[PDB]
Structures are given as C-alpha cells and as structure tokens.
Symmetry: C3
Subunit: 407 residues, 3 copies
C-alpha cells in the first residue's frame, strides 16, 4: 500500500465527495454514516495521548536536569509567546488587507450564553502542581502530568546515582518498564496511522458537507483572510525562523507531513500529540526536549488560534461598525497572548480566550449585536478550525526544532 | 478445613436459616446483621476485577496476534450470539410449557419511571476505544480496558522482537512487572475464596429472607419456569456443545464448581470474573484465549438473562392477556440478542434490555398495566437473579473451552 | 544553606510579620499575595502522599504477614484508642482548670447548617475494602489504598516463594518497580522540603494576619487552655510513654522536628504524611511498621483534635452556662474516641466529630444559642488548628516508635 500518500488520496477524494453531498442536501446523511469512521481515527489517536506523554518524559528526564530542561523551558516559552504575538498581528494585518464583515446587516436574536470566565491566575498556576498524580493521569490533565513526569524523571536520575545497588537496581527496573510503555505507544501510533486514510476521508467528508456548502457570501472573505494569514504565518514566521537557525525548511516539512495532516482533520492539538511526538523522534530530536516541548505546546502554543482571534475580532467590529481605535489594536495583540497563559489548563479554552479578547476591545458576547455576528462565524468554524489547528501543531514542531539546534 | 465443600455446607445451611427467618418475619433483621458479611465477600471479589483483567491480557497478548486473537474473537462472538439466541427461544418454549400469569388481575398504580434508552449504537461501539486508558481503569469500564490491554499486548510483543536490545530490555521488564500484578491477584483470589463460605452463607441468608417467603403463588410458576429453563440450558445447549467438542462435561463441571457457586451468590457476572478466570487457568487454558473471552463474556454473553427475558415478556403479556402474536415471538428472540450488543457497556443494562425487549413486543413499561405486572416480578427478582447469573458465567467458560479446543 | 533552621528563621519572622500586618489591617492583602507561596508548599507535599503511601507498603509488606502486621496493627490500634482517650480527658481537665466562657453573653442568629451525619458504621467498615483499587488511588482514599497495598504485598511475598521461577521472576520485577516509585517520592520529599522555609513563612504570615489579631479576650483563655493542654499532652503522654518504652524522648524530638513543624504550618495530618514517613524511615524504623501505622494514624489518631473537642464542648456549655453533669463528662470522653473510629474515611469529619461530641453532651449545633457560641470559636480556629495538627502527627510517630520497640 502506497501509505502516507494514501492519506492525501483520501483527503482530496473526501473533500470533493463531502462538498458534493453538501450542496446536494445530504449533510445529515453524512453525519449518521460517514462520520463515525472519522471519529474512530480521532478516538484511537486520543487513546495514546496519556501514556505516551507520561511515559516519554519520565524516560525523557534522563537529561541534564537544570541546564537542559530549565533552559529548554525558558527558550520554548519565550519562543511560544513571541510567535503568538506574531500570529495575532498577522491576523490584524490580514483583516485590514481584506475586509471581513463589510455589510452592516445581521438580524438580531438567538445567541451566546457567554462562556464561564477563566479561573484566577494564581489558581491556574498553583494547579500545574497536581495533588493526586494518579488523578491527573486518570482524567486528561496534561499540565499536572508534565510537572509530575519531570519531577519523577529527575528523581529517578538521582536514584540511579546511588552508592547502594539495591536502590540503583529497583530504580532501573521502573524506568525500563516506563520506557516499555513509551515505546509501546509509538508502535500503536504506527497502527492507528494505518487507519488514517479511512479516517481522514471520513473527517473532511463531514466538515465539507455540514459547513462547506455554507462557505459562500461574506464568510468567504473570512475563510480566505484567515487561510492566507495561516499560509503567511507558515511562510513568514516558521520558514524564516527555521532558516535562520540552520534547519532545512523542506526537509522539516517532509518530516512534519504526518503530524500536519492529522492535526488538519482531527482539529485537536492535544489529540495529535502521539503523531507530533513520533514525528519528532523520527526527526532525530532527543526525548529531553520533544517529550516536554510538544505537550506544553499543545496547551500554550496556539498560533493558529491567535491569528483567528485577530480576524474574528475585526469581523465582529466590522459587522457592528466599530472604528477599532486608530492606534489601539495593540490591546487585541496583548490580551491574545495573555489569554493563552491565563487559560492554560482550563478546558474549553478556545471559546473563553476569544470571549476575553473580544471583551478587551469592548465587544462583549453579551451585547446581542456582537453575539449575532459571532453566531455567523460559527456557521463556518469547523472549516476555520482545520487550518488553525494545523498551524497550532506546526509551531510546536518548529519551536522544538529551534530549541534542538540551540540546546 | 474441608473447603469448597465448606461453601456447599454454608449454602444449604444459610438458605434454610434465611428461609426460616423469612416466614417468621425477621427479614430486616437479616438485612441489618447477616447481610454485611455477604457484602464483604462481594467487595473483596470486585476488588480484584480491574487489575486481574488488565494484567492477564497484556500478558495474554503474548500470542500470535491476528490468527489467534482475531479468530478466537470471531468464534467467541459467533458462539455468544447463537447461545443467546437459543436461551431466549428456550425461555419462550418454557413459558408456553408453563403458564406464568394465568390470573388476569394485578392492581394498578405505583410503578416504573422507565429506564434510560440505550445510547446510539455508534456511540457505544466508538466507546470501546477509550480516550484516557488510565481513566478506563480508574472507574469500572471493562470493555475499553479489554481494547487497551490487547492493543498494549500486541505492541509489547512487537517491541520484544527489535534488533535493539535496550528496547527489548525495557519491553521485557514492563511485561514481567504487569505479569507480577497478574499472578498477584490470582494468589489473592485464593485467599478471598477462603472467606467465600461465610459470604455464601450470609448472601442466601438474605435472598431467602427478603424474597424467599414471597416465592409462593403465581410467582412460584415463574421461578419454576425460569429455573427449569436454566437447567435445560445447561443440559441441552452446554452439555451437548461441550460433548460435541471433545471435552468431558463432568470434568468441566468439577472445575467450574467455584465459579458457578460464587456467581450464584454474588449475582454479578463481572464481579465473579477473578473466580471464573482463576478457574480457567486452573482448567489449563492459555491466557491468549481465556484472558480475552471471559471479560468479554461478562458483558456480551448473558444467556441466563436472555432466557429470563423470554419468560418475563410472556409473564407480562399473560397478565394483560395479549396473544403474543401466533407466530411472531421471533421478534422477542431477535431483539433479545440485539439487546446484548446494543447495550454493551452502558451501566444498569439489565433493566434497559428488558425495557426494549418488552417495547419490541408492544408492551411499554410506560403503560400502568404492564408496569404493575412487572413490579410483581421484581419481588422475586433476586431469587431469579441467582439462577440467571450462574448461567451467564457458565456459557463464558463453555465458549472459552470450545475455542480452546478449536484454536 | 543552614536548612531545617531556615524553616525556624522563617516561622518566627513570618509569625511576627503576619501579626504586624494583622493589627494594621492588611489581612486580606496577605491573602492575595503571601498566601499562594504557602499553598504551593502544601500542594507539593500533597502531591506525594498517594504514590508514597501505596508504594512504601506493598514494599512494606515484605515482612512476616500475620505475626507482624496483625500484632503490629492490633498494638497500634489499642495504642491509638488509649492516647485519644487521654487527650480528651486532658482537654476536660484543662477546661476545668481554665474557664473558657465566663461571660454568658453572645448575641444570637448567624450560625451552622449542621454537617452531614456520619455514614452508618457498617458502610464505613465495608468501605475499607476498595472496589476498584485504581479508583481509590485516582482519588484520595487513604484507607482503602492501605488495605490494597497490604493485600498486594502479602500476595507478592507468597509469589516470590514459588518453585517456578517465571512466577518468581515476574513478582520480583513488579516489586522493584513499585519500590522504584517508593524511593523516588522520598527523594522528592527532600526537594519539597527545600521549599519549606518559604512555604512556612508564607503560611503563618496568613494565619497570624487573618486570625491572629482576633485572639484577644475570652478566646485568649481558650487558645491558652488548648495549647497548655497540647503541651501537657506531649510532656505527660508522649515523653512518658516514650521513656517507659526505651526510646530517648529528646532524640525522638530531634528526629520528629521536620514532620512536627510542617504539620504545624500545613495543618494537614495526611498532607504531611511524606514528611512524617521519611522522618520515620530516617528514624531507622522498618517499612513493615511505619508504612502501615503512619497513614492509619493520619486517619484515626487525632490526639490534638480530640483534646480540642474536650475544651470546645466546655466552652460552649460555659457560654450557655450548662452544668456539664457533675460526673457525666465521661460521655464526652467516650463519644470523642468513638467519633474517630465512627468517622474513619468520611471527609470533613473534623466538624462532624465535634458535631456529635456536642450532641452527646446535649448541646446540638442546631440550638442558635450553642451555634452562636461555636461560631465564636471558629474565629480563632486556624490558630487552634496548627497546635492540634502538630499533636495529631506526634502520636502517629510516637505509636510507630513504640510498636517498633515492641515488635
Ligand atoms: N481545535 C483547536 C486545536 O486543537 O488546536 C483549538 O480548539 C481546542 C483547544 C485546544 C487547546 C486549548 C484550547 C482549545 C482551537 O481552535 O483553538
Ligand atoms: N446479575 C446478572 C449478571 O451479572 O449476569 C445480570 O445483571 C447484570 C447485567 C450484566 C450485563 C448486562 C445486563 C445486566 C442479570 O440480572 O441479568
Ligand atoms: N488539622 C487536623 C488534622 O489534619 O489532623 C484536622 O483537620 C483536617 C481533617 C482531617 C480529617 C478529617 C477531617 C478534617 C482536625 O482539626 O481534626
């Protein structure tokens, strides 16, 4: 079987056969038939995310405790914050280049219930230190898991340096077992990726059926302004920073191919952690960097979302007719990067970041005009999700590759 | 101590001392006193179910991946479906041989709230793939655990055949650790089984006290119609299929003794998984079969239940006086087997399988007449439960032994 | 760094800097600035409790199954019950010595909703057997964890004495891995303790700011009675039971220093289990004993709390001016120890014990006279909490040290 080129065969063939069933009216025929097979690929990928993160990090933290992780962390965080600053500013620039929401229309009535406010920042940061590390594992919670795997990984290094060889014996057993699990999930990530072409096919067969035949109108200018923005993010920020650190862009892209396409159809950043990690091991990076930077990046580094929040804020302010302060769009840029940090763990964050970025400008989702305009964006949001998720994993790999060269 | 005949001693003694306290009115004195000792034995048994299943299946998947597990799995499923088909039809045949519900009385008022409808089949089948496999373990969920153990066990076998002997070194360590846990619970099961005769005593001391002195009247005909059906299930379908597959029935029965009797007093098919599994290993069956077919069978193969649903539907339709379609009791048979698959994981399925098999014939529990008659069955439901749970586990062992001979 | 004296340098400075901020109004400034650092420390400790308890007890159940554990447990329980009986009677004796509640004022009408009643005893005991051992781990549940670790450890020992060396091979592998984790958590308890000085400083900085400057008046007589009582507990019961058992009290206090001081600033018996456990290991005691008698003591042996319940009953009855039965304060003492067994696992028990000790005397929290007095105590409750939690862990160490010398 061709494989990995079979995904692309299923991608193009699906996107057309869904789009054809979309304009013909069979959107909810696809939902009750084709979709479950596309979900199956997502479920199987998600299955691996917890073991592969915990395992490959305890193993990963056999690596110079402070000088690595500490400086790796500091660099990857400084990378993440600056790329997200670019992402939003390019989204603003693209929404001034285009004009999404030219028509001051939009009928008013039937709208948002306003997402719950982000928890106090102190109670977000204090929460990266888990209280029951079995608990964190037992339900999602990547951030407390990252903390625990590093603190266990550093301890088990300090254990294998013990002058007692019952201590250095038992510590070696545990680490190997945990490494067993690590390697096991990477073997299943090859299995789950064999089903990908059936899953990929069935995923865009639904997105193009339910939201594709709705991409026309003023919303076409949104989808274009976002996607051109996302393309320019890839070329202007990723390729340039990749070149300026001496790692070949196309050799990077050839390796990233698997992780990119699963992120594009899964529309889950943390969901495609197993594929983005395997693609980083397959890329030659050590587990001391990638086992840490990738899951952290699937939680803080949202470049595609930060760009989408650029153009979405403008859209709504254009749908109402707000002047957007001839000078103070630097507030939309500031609280878009501050959103990612102050939302960190808190689940369903994509809706609550945009909520506080829209409130930052002065367009709360509570005023029925702002909300009716946001409602029209949500008619084509799965289309925009694909492109923005795909950039959310690119930044992860790109930052991981830069930290790999520096450290 | 005599032991394993100590169970039979406590059973006969307990059932008499329960039944004697039953007709003397001290049913709630047994609830508040004898009962907890019966609960302890169930608690301790349940305790081992999660580790023993997960452990002995990762270990269990050290066995030719496709040709075994696949064909094992296909056979056992084809077995399960056809045994469930016989069971319901034998229940129909036993309900036409007897006449449960001769009196068209039953006073109306005070009945069911109608159980929750079974989740859409695609969100039951997709649910067999877990998302957080640690979470699967964290709270019950035998089905997604089975899927993960097997997917881990296939991964850990492919890992051991690697040309790198750091990867095989770490694979072996993990497998053996997991196998430590496997053997651990099996050694515990021997202990918990030493408490069995006290637990056994205290359980039928309750069931006969609370529902025993209630088994008189038209309900005696039901209990006789179900139990003669359960006896004939073992004799006509198990002892025939066992013999026709070249394994001695009595040699099988002698080995099944422990598993049979705890299932009869626990009334939990998954609850007596460690005893049915220990009895399978002690039977000499390999972990490549029994470690997969037994926890699957405590979730799909409910022959005793499917048989009970035959006579229960007939009881309600005779209480009302419905004709039961002179020909179309095939619809009762059909939806009984399709209840087992379409319920799978979903908790409290015993009521929801019967809710839809009754709805299939045309007797909804929403109708105050149907539900008034169904309320009378529940007054002797734990009497019926013992017999049906005991046949639920037999077929799991019977199927396991048939697959062992075949594969 | 000086260390373990840098804790003391922070405690004194923090107690004065909180107290100074308190009588100057800036209590709620300290809550929103200093307090988080104090929390970080407590979160970090609580993080270890669940692995450290489970691990160092499967490993700790490498030791003569019955003769040890059985007799160990039966000693430590009889120990626990007698020390808790002393504590409450030293509470009554210190409350008759002082007179907390001279003034029969207290204005009425702003009071307690009455804490949920303690679950029936049989469902407390039956609940010490967990039903899903992974469950118990995944969420708190120190008692059922204890029961699983001990039943695992007994089984893994019997497993290691098998004439087959595939079973003995795997059991040894499992045990080392579990011990890998055991060791690892201790290595971490050294790191988490390096943060203690800052954590300690920020913790009394709070309690002295929010409840310090409220310690004046008739509540001063309370605080004094309790603390004098708790001091007289340590001198008269621990140092006397230590001496009489042949373990130098001051050498014991040199060793207990770390666990004593964190229990005082954390106010969490079970939260400082890691510091109490490493200080038992570093004391030279065996995992056979300490690994079982320490968590079981952070769940039954609240000496300092049962002392408080003595003087609190008196204060409330003094506030109302009840005679406290010229004789029947024995019923306070009796139900005070029963409270500890009869509350076991059941969370929030602290209040739910005081509830029933007060109801025992005959002053339910529901009488808005009793309740208006009880809410006055709660004003200086964190101040009393420190002193009593530190006496709650001392008894756990003291018992373990007595049982070590005996067994
Ligand atoms: N679907 C996107 C992704 O997974 O990258 C993402 O939605 C999910 C999400 C993931 C992480 C944090 C917040 C929200 C987004 O659109 O921002
Ligand atoms: N007690 C029986 C068993 O566990 O086999 C069974 O109850 C539980 C159950 C198990 C599986 C599916 C439905 C219901 C029944 O009463 O039919
Ligand atoms: N601080 C005490 C302790 O942890 O020992 C304790 O407070 C916490 C607690 C512990 C156990 C049950 C309920 C509440 C008490 O005052 O009884």
């Amino acid at each position: 079987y061709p494989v990995l080129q079979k995904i692309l065969i299923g991608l193009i063939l699906g996107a057309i056969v869904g789009l054809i069933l979309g304009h013909y009216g069979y959107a909810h025929a696809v939902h009750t038939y084709v979709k479950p097979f596309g979900d199956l690929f997502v479920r199987l990928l998600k299955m691996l995310v917890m073991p592969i993160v915990f395992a490959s990090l305890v193993v990963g933290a056999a690596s110079i405790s402070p000088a690595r992780l500490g400086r790796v962390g500091v660099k990857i965080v400084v990378y993440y914050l600056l790329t997200s600053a670019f992402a939003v500013t390019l989204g603003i620039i693209m929404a001034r280049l285009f004009n999404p929401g030219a028509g001051i229309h939009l009928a008013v009535g039937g709208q948002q219930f306003q997402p719950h406010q982000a928890p106090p920042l102190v109670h977000i940061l204090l929460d990266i230190v888990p209280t029951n590390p079995f608990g964190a594992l037992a339900n999602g919670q990547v951030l407390p898991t990252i903390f625990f795997a590093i603190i266990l990984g550093i301890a088990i290094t300090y254990l294998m340096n013990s002058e007692n060889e019952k201590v250095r014996k038992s510590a070696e057993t545990l680490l190997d077992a945990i490494n067993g699990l690590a390697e096991a999930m990477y073997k299943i990530v090859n299995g789950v990726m064999q089903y990908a072409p059936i899953g990929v096919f069935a995923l865009i067969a639904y997105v193009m059926a339910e939201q594709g035949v709705h991409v026309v109108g003023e919303l076409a200018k949104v989808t274009a302004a976002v996607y051109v923005g996302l393309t320019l993010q890839i070329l202007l920020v990723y390729f340039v920073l990749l070149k300026i650190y001496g790692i070949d862009p196309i050799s990077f892209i050839k390796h990233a191919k698997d992780a990119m396409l699963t992120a594009f159809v899964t529309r889950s950043s943390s969901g495609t952690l197993p594929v983005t990690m395997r693609v980083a091991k397959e890329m030659g990076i050590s587990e001391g960097i990638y086992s840490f930077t990738l899951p952290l990046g699937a939680t803080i580094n949202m470049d595609g979302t930060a760009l989408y929040q650029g153009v979405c804020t403008f859209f709504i302010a254009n749908a109402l007719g707000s002047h957007l302060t001839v000078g103070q769009q630097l507030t939309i840029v500031l609280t878009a990067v501050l959103a990612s940090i102050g939302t960190a763990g808190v689940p369903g964050a994509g809706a609550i970041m945009l909520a506080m970025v829209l409130h930052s400008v002065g367009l709360p989702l509570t005023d029925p005009n702002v909300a009716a305009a946001y409602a029209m964006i949500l008619g084509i949001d799965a289309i925009l999700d694909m492109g923005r998720t795909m950039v959310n994993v690119t930044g992860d790999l790109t930052g991981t590759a830069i930290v790999a060269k520096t450290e």
